[PDB]
Design a protein around this ligand. Sequence first.
Ligand SMILES: Cc1cn([C@H]2C[C@H](OP(=O)(O)O)[C@@H](COP(=O)(O)O)O2)c(=O)[nH]c1=O
Ligand SMILES: [Ca+2]
Length: 129
Amino acid sequence: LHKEPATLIKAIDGDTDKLMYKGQPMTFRRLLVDTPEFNEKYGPEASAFTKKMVENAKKIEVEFDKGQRTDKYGRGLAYIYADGKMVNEALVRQGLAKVAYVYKGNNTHEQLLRKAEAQAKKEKLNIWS
Ligand SMILES: Cc1cn([C@H]2C[C@H](OP(=O)(O)O)[C@@H](COP(=O)(O)O)O2)c(=O)[nH]c1=O
Ligand SMILES: [Ca+2]
């Protein structure tokens, strides 16, 4: 897979951010994760976590997988990196997202994330507390 440049337009929520990619504004949905809704336990904390990561980053990158690059809502599907740290993975590792929406072809980093979730669960972090 390849990291590509993007700039933060606006942090949205635990699952999504508005990013400028190839000079066009786009909502990006993070591959392989599901964060709680704002009304759900740890929903606000998940959005807060990603907001800080993306806002504080000097460099945002997007990494498409081998399959669909846009979902049925027109959202980009990618791994999102903030100063080379993957936000997707970071969420799961902190117990603020579950691994989810694993479709064949778009699952390059599935095992990495599952390992993170196992650790979060063992440490009883957040949604696993
Ligand atoms: C994460 C992801 C979601 N989606 C679709 C499935 C879901 O359809 P439905 O809206 O019909 O439930 C929705 C979940 O995204 P959200 O968790 O952001 O709602 O986005 C994909 O098609 N591919 C993906 O990789
Ligand atoms: Ca969600």
